[PDB]
């Protein structure tokens, strides 16, 4: 969600209007105001095609975080637009481990809260204790208030 907003902070909206133009060219292919399973089929066999069905049924059932249950119009749009590659730095293992050192300042492989709190406070931007609640759910996959590294990894892998 948030990512949507940052990327739109990159560029402006007139762009989006001409996108809409491109799409009047495309938007043939909603069965349900959505672009769902049969629409995936329809607009993709438009050229006799469909995504690698891992992608396809993935969109059907899985990437529904919300309980959308289906490929919405939004979800087929999601695949078709996440096409062009732009993510930054996706930070991960060796990063996240050297980080985990001061994360688990404990020197133990099990972070405590306030080392992470310090890192949060000293990032350069906003720490919602909502998001800290998120992170306790996430980071400590054990959720025992103390995090083995890989837990923190998948908690922090793959993001700017």
């Amino acid at each position: 969600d948030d990512i949507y907003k940052a990327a739109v902070e990159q560029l402006t909206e007139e762009q989006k209007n001409e996108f809409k133009a491109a799409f009047d060219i495309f938007v043939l292919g909603a069965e349900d105001g959505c672009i769902s399973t049969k629409e995936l089929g329809k607009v993709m066999r438009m050229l006799g095609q469909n995504p690698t069905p891992e992608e396809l049924q993935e969109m059907i059932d899985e990437v529904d975080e919300d309980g959308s249950g289906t490929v919405d119009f939004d979800e087929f749009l999601v695949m078709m637009v996440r096409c062009m590659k732009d993510d930054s730095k996706g930070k991960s293992e060796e990063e996240l481990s050297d980080l985990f050192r001061m994360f688990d300042k404990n020197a133990d492989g099990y972070i405590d809260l306030d080392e992470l709190k310090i890192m949060l406070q000293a990032t350069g931007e906003t720490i919602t204790e909502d998001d800290i609640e998120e992170l306790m759910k996430d980071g400590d996959k054990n959720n025992d208030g103390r995090i083995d590294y890989d837990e923190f990894l998948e908690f922090m892998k793959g993001v700017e």
Binding site: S97, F100, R101, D104, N106, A107, D108, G109, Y110, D148, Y149, D150
Partner: peptide, 9 residues
């Protein structure tokens, strides 16, 4: 340190 992690896992 990271083997504190390793023994943890």
């Amino acid at each position: 340190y990271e083997i504190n992690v390793l023994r943890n896992r």
